[PDB]
Design a protein around this nucleic acid. Structure first.
Length: 70
DNA sequence: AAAATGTGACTTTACCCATAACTTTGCCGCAACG
């Protein structure tokens, strides 16, 4: 899981700052919890690619992008 | 930090259908005048 990541970074030759920010993203939990607001349907989707739940704040402008990325 | 869910069982006007009930009105006779 980590050796493949390192080889991917080496192949793309990502700078130290970029790899650091990527590791911070892949380690840190989401910054804010999704709130429904007032006109947005919010919620969770099971991403089998990652294998975890992903939060979306809109089911007709952001969720379809999630399906595409899955 | 943020766009996308009204809905359906219940009740109510509206038109048609059949019949009762009073008023219309042409088709006929009958009395009166020319």
């Amino acid at each position: 899981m980590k050796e493949q990541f390192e080889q991917w970074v080496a192949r793309l030759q990502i700078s130290e700052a970029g790899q650091k920010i990527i590791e911070k993203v892949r380690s840190s939990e989401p910054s804010r919890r999704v709130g429904g607001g007032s006109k947005n349907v919010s919620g969770r989707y099971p991403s089998r690619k990652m294998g975890v739940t992903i939060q979306f704040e809109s089911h007709r402008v952001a969720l379809p992008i999630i399906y595409q990325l899955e």
